[PDB]
């Protein structure tokens, strides 16, 4: 989850989110360099009493400032698109889980074997247990096996929602009539939080997602106990 | 024809700066106040 005064991304929980971190570092270096260069040149143009006000020929310099930006764009697009096609590669999941958005909560279905489903609602602030996080805890977490490739299928039974877990690099819109797929793989056990990411009415701010990543054997006993 | 020149090519008078202040106050202040009174209206329903 986010922590106070955080400046950048949540630490990566998945290999794809680690890739996104390194790609963002690359792109942010470029963004800082170009912003700084423009600020510097502004200051340079503004700090001399020397003048030259006659017509200036543009053709030569316009080669520089089209070719160099084109090269920079290619140096962004190449790693960008590599990650895009990695995220899309075939992976062979071990488990399929569905989530359906609703006003204002999420339901989850694990129907590979048995008829397992439940609703997941935010814990009201007045009912938080000591040390629990305001607006982020839920009553029934999405328990999942760690270190395993999971297919998540996302839909909605009313308006648009969007199912997001920042530290896994996940955000998939929840659209009625549509079954959107994403893949989830956590490198670590733990609790990973997200929040509804499409405006969905009165309690859009108050329908969070909490994944609970544990070893397979604990996931199997939890699943059985939830029937 | 119409009046021409500074202060004459506008739909509001600038002949007296204090009447102008009142008019500008009402004009810009009504636009700024409207959303606050619409919020009040929406809260006082239910």
């Amino acid at each position: 989850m986010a922590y106070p005064m955080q400046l950048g991304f949540q630490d990566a929980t998945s290999p794809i989110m680690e890739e996104l971190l390194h790609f963002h570092d690359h792109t942010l270096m470029i963004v800082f360099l170009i912003s700084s260069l423009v600020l510097y040149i502004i200051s340079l143009m503004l700090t001399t009493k020397l003048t030259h006000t006659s017509t200036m020929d543009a053709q030569e310099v316009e080669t520089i400032w089209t070719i160099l930006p084109a090269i920079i764009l290619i140096l962004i697009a190449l790693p960008s698109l590599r990650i895009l096609y990695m995220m899309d590669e075939i992976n062979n999941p071990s488990l399929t889980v569905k989530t359906m958005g609703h006003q204002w909560y999420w339901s989850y279905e694990y129907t590979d074997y048995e008829d397992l489903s439940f609703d997941s609602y935010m814990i009201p602030t007045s009912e938080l247990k000591p040390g629990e996080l305001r607006l982020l805890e839920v009553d029934n977490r999405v328990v999942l096996p760690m270190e395993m490739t999971i297919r998540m299928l996302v839909s909605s039974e009313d308006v648009l929602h969007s199912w997001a877990v920042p530290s896994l690099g996940l955000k998939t819109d929840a659209i009625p009539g549509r079954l959107n797929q994403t893949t989830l793989m956590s490198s670590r056990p733990g609790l990973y939080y997200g929040q509804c990411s499409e405006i969905c009415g009165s309690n859009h701010s108050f329908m969070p997602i909490v994944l609970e990543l544990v070893p397979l054997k604990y996931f199997e006993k939890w699943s059985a106990s939830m029937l | 024809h119409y009046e021409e020149g500074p202060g004459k090519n506008i739909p509001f008078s600038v002949e007296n700066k204090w009447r102008l202040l009142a008019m500008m106050t009402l004009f810009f202040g009504s636009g700024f106040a409207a959303p606050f009174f619409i919020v009040r209206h929406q809260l006082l329903k239910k």
Binding site: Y3, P4, M5, P130, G131 | -
Partner: protein, 49 residues
């Protein structure tokens, strides 16, 4: 002939700066705003369970 800035610029700069610092320090520290700074190096963790 000195203009407004020659006559009053020093006083506007000094008074405006002193006022701005005083009122923002007061707002930031004396009226109970919760800035929620990082607990790192600040908070002693306490048993919760």
């Amino acid at each position: 002939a000195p203009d407004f800035h020659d006559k009053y610029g020093n006083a506007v700069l000094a008074s405006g700066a002193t006022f701005c610092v005083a009122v923002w320090v007061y707002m930031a520290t004396q009226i109970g705003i919760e800035w929620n700074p990082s607990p790192v190096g600040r908070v002693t963790p306490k048993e919760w369970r």
